Amino acid sequence: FKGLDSKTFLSEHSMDMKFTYCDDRITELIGYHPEELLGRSAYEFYHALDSENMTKSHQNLCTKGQVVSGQYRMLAKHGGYVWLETQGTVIYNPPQCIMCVNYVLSE
Amino acid sequence: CQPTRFISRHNIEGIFTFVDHRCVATVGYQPQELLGKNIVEFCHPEDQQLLRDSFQQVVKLKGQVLSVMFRFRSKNQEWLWMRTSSFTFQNPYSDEIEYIICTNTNVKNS
Numbered sequence: 001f002k003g004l005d006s007k008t009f010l011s012e013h014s015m016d017m018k019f020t021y022c023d024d025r026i027t028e029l030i031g032y033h034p035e036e037l038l039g040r041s042a043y044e045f046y047h048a049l050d051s052e053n054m055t056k057s058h059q060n061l062c063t064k065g066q067v068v069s070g071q072y073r074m075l076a077k078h079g080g081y082v083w084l085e086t087q088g089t090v091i092y093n094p095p096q097c098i099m100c101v102n103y104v105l106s107e
Numbered sequence: 108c109q110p111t112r113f114i115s116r117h118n119i120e121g122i123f124t125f126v127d128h129r130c131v132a133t134v135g136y137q138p139q140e141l142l143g144k145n146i147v148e149f150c151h152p153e154d155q156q157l158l159r160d161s162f163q164q165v166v167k168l169k170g171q172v173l174s175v176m177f178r179f180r181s182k183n184q185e186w187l188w189m190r191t192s193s194f195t196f197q198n199p200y201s202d203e204i205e206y207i208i209c210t211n212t213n214v215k216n217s
């Protein structure tokens with residue numbers, strides 16, 4: 001049994017959805033090292049069956065400024081898929097970036 | 108019967124910068140659903156790294172044809188087998204960064 005907290009990590013993304021930052025906690029959960037993530041779009045990682053759905057969540061995020069993804073799968077670093085749910089928030093300045101609070105469902 | 112194919116151009120990173128409208132009937136997306144996204148975003152996880160190394164090498168090959176086979180996720184969320192043949196072009200009156208011209212054909216893997 002992991003704490004909900006030990007299943008939660010942050011990531012930051014450019015508006016094109018590439019990773020610009022990821023918490024190191026993602027390593028223990030999904031296998032990736034945060035630095036191999038940078039410069040790659042989130043879309044590289046979504047299960048094909050969740051892809052159009054995430055595309056819609058993204059549209060809502062760009063229109064409303066904040067979205068809850070509802071459920072999707074991420075390809076793990078060493079095969080297979082982890083279910084997640086994400087809260088996304090656009091940080092606009094005077095859009096600058098996307099803050100993602102990611103919770104791993106499938107323990 | 109005519110194979111289904113469409114032309115695309117990409118930066119050296121893989122981002123679609125031009126999409127021929129024959130893509131609708133080939134993979135089902137409109138050009139602007141593809142433009143500005145990386146081609147690896149439509150690629151099957153098992154084929155992603157092959158395709159990234161293919162873009163990396165095509166620019167080393169003196170403008171000769173590099174071919175690659177991979178699964179591409181149609182607008183139906185279905186994996187289609189693509190053969191993408193690609194080559195660099197760089198206008199020799201200039202020193203602008205080369206880019207990559209692709210032809211993309213739905214082929215049989217069998």
Ligand SMILES: N#Cc1cc(F)cc(Oc2ccc3c(c2C(F)F)[C@@H](O)C(F)(F)S3(=O)=O)c1
Pocket residue numbers: 011013017018042045046054055057058059061067068069073074075086087088089098100102
């Ligand atoms: N697989 C995956 C994955 C793993 C992560 F740690 C973050 C991530 O980026 C996401 C995930 C969910 C969403 C997004 C992102 C994103 F910022 F890249 C946003 O599109 C969104 F609009 F907030 S969203 O809820 O659709 C995608």
